[PDB]
Ligand binder design. Structure first.
Ligand code: HEC
Length: 104
């Protein structure tokens, strides 16, 4: 994926609810630092839904690609309000950005 393009997608569609940086604040949604290789619902100090806590998958390219296409289909009852990103290339660019930003 294209990290520069992924950043712009993130700013447009995600940043109002999420931070990525180490020590970044929770906002409407959890800070995403450290997501890759972590099970759902594991950002410390955030009130997740039981739906998000209970999904039980491990975040990575494959599961993000699916989630981000249609978040509520993947995690019904999530409190994340975001309809999804249809395009595969856009999702891959976004995920590439997250893989960098959430591990710096
Ligand atoms: C607010 C209006 C949000 C927008 C826009 C996006 N997200 Fe979100 N996200 C939000 C909340 C409130 C939550 C918690 C949901 C719950 O049911 O408890 C989330 C959760 C996620 C997660 C899961 C985190 C985890 O399991 O630790 C991810 C991976 C995620 N959000 C990513 C994400 C991306 C990449 C976004 C733009 C495409 C995006 N979210 C938008 C709130 C909001």
């Amino acid at each position: 994926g294209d990290v520069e393009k992924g950043k712009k997608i993130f700013v447009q569609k995600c940043a109002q609810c999420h931070t990525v940086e180490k020590g970044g604040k929770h906002k409407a949604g959890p800070n995403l630092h450290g997501l890759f290789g972590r099970k759902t619902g594991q950002a410390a100090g955030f009130s997740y839904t039981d739906a998000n806590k209970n999904k039980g998958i491990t975040w990575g390219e494959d599961t993000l690609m699916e989630y981000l296409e249609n978040p509520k289909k993947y995690i019904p009852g999530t409190k994340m309000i975001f309809a999804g990103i249809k395009k595969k290339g856009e999702r891959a660019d976004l995920i590439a950005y997250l893989k960098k930003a959430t591990n710096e």
